[PDB]
Amino acid sequence: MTVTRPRAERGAFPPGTEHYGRSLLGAPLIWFPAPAASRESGLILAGTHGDENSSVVTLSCALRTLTPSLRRHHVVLCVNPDGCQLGLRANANGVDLNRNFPAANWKEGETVYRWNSAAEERDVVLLTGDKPGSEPETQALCQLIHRIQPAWVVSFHDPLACIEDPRHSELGEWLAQAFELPLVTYETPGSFGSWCADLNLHCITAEFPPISSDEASEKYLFAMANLLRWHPKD
Template sequence: MTITLRSRQQRGQFELKPEIYGQSVLGAALLYFPAQVHNADSGLIIAGTHGDETASITSLSCALRSIQTQYLHHHVILSVNPDGNQLGTRANANGVDLNRNFACNNWLQGGTVYRWSTHEPERDVLIGTGKTGNSEPETQALCQLIDELEPAWVVSLHEPLACIDDPANSDLGQWFANQMQVPLVGDVGYETPGSFGSWCAERDLLCVTVELPAVSSDFASQEYQAMLVDLLTGKANTD
């Protein structure tokens, strides 16, 4: 099936209206765009878990605004962490890394560290993991939404590690690796306790973490638009 994209002049606004699935620490609406071709194969695509990872948010938004509503096969969250987006921080407004706050067996109290920039050799910037697993409203709302939607899989967009993190070595993970010409790996090279991927693994829910390279939003929106359009419209290899 040939997908006709919306004209570029129309892409400044969304054709599809999002729905609210929760509220952030500072009261921002947590929004998702529901699949319009909804079946047992529908997945969930998320971005913005880390508020400072803007290239993945923008490129996914551009792809979503480029397609006609009736072709959307999967649910989409453009920003899991809208407070972090506004503040320009990895963490949410409570200073918690949402990707270390999921209530799974390997969640750790006491905080974690991240790398200040890709130019720094060490991960030494301190950040919280929450008082308990699933302590943050953004984490709670995402888990509840997944329980309601029951997606067949989840794709989580991040940056800037330039790899596909897929311990299951799935067809979908291989498709992304081929599309982006980046390595398919079983882990990102360091421990990620309390991560969304760990939570999904404990639920036997396939999670493919797509790590864009360290590129600008403008570059990502151009370079990955065709790939993301194929993903959104059901053309990706998700078997």
């Protein structure tokens, strides 16, 4: 009946969850199949990086806020659940998963990244994997996308405050309006966006700003929930 479930009921997910694999350490890889599924259904995902959690919690809350039958798009809350309980960027093998996809530009070697926003120089080192798509997490996500074939992917990260949509599109600016973030128009080797580029899978990286889970779950709750509900207003 209502657009949203009463707050008193939002402690738990609506029943429906499936598993799409297992993490390196044995935690399930989880995804939430859209109830209103169709060929227009996109894939919304988060937590590729274990320390990027404002977007994980906000999407979880949105999932638990929007009445099920209104959700059009498939959701993965956390791509990297090991890195996530270890509060770190990489998975459990030290691999920057977003340098591990079996894209055409997957170079093997080392990657580096910034300590925080106040970090200035990308010095903190990680690896890229042994072979392309080497990690369990990478394959599972890739296999999940090939099976369901989303019309588009929106990949949440942080803390750059913007929407990155190389297509310049209706979604990428719906996203700009509703999250009040600037829009901006993939070469990052072995990243998710390069791998989608190869397939002409539309991929928008949704870069949260540095924000608490406590603020985001209020500030960004509605924009997120509307994202699960989105359709080109035509």
